C-alpha cells in the first residue's frame, strides 16, 4: 500500500480567510501510489459560512494525474482510498478522522488521465466539520496532516 502524508502548512491563515468569507481551495503535490503506480493528488476546500449545504465544512477530493507509468497500469484505477485527517494530540489512542472510499470501475474520475490533472475528482463534500478542529489537536505547529493511503 502506498501512503502519502500531505503536510498543509500555514493553516491558521487559511482558517482566517474562511472566517472572512474568502474562498479557500488547496491542491496537494502529485504523489505516486507506488513505483510503478498511479499518480494522484488531493483537493481540499474550506467551505464558506454562507454556503447552502456544507457550510463550514472541510471538503476533500482525490484526483488522478498523468504519470510515468500510466501506459503500464490497468485502467480505470480500481481499489480503495483511505483519506485521514490525523490527530496530533499526545494521547494514545489518538482519534483520527477517516473515511474509506471505494474506487468503482464505473466512474470517470479514475479513468486514464489525458490532461496533467484530471478535473474530475472523487471525494467528500462534507469530510469534516471545522468545529471539530477546535476540539482536538489536529493543528500542530500551525500545520494540518492529511493522510492518503491507497490500496489496489
Amino acid at each position: 500500500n502506498g501512503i502519502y502524508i500531505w503536510k498543509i502548512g500555514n493553516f491558521g491563515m487559511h482558517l482566517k480567510c474562511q472566517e472572512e468569507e474568502k474562498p479557500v481551495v488547496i491542491h496537494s503535490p502529485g504523489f505516486y501510489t507506488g513505483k510503478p503506480g498511479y499518480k494522484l493528488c488531493m483537493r481540499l476546500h474550506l467551505q464558506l459560512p454562507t454556503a447552502q449545504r456544507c457550510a463550514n465544512y472541510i471538503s476533500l477530493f482525490v484526483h488522478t494525474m498523468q504519470g510515468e507509468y500510466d501506459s503500464h497500469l490497468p485502467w480505470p484505477f480500481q481499489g480503495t482510498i483511505r483519506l485521514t485527517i490525523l490527530d496530533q494530540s499526545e494521547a494514545p489512542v489518538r482519534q483520527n478522522h477517516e473515511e474509506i472510499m471505494d474506487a468503482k470501475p464505473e466512474l470517470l474520475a479514475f479513468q486514464r488521465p489525458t490532461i496533467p490533472r484530471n478535473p474530475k475528482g472523487f471525494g467528500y463534500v462534507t469530510f469534516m466539520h471545522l468545529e471539530a478542529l477546535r476540539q482536538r489537536t489536529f493543528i500542530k505547529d500551525d500545520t494540518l496532516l492529511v493522510r492518503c493511503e491507497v490500496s489496489t
Binding site: 477530493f61 473515511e99 472510499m101 470517470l108 478535473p119 474530475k120 475528482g121 472523487f122 467528500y124 463534500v125
Partner: peptide, 9 residues
C-alpha cells in the same frame, strides 16, 4: 456522509 464525483471548477 457518502463520497461523490466532483469536478473543478
Amino acid at each position: 456522509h457518502g463520497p461523490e464525483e466532483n469536478e473543478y471548477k
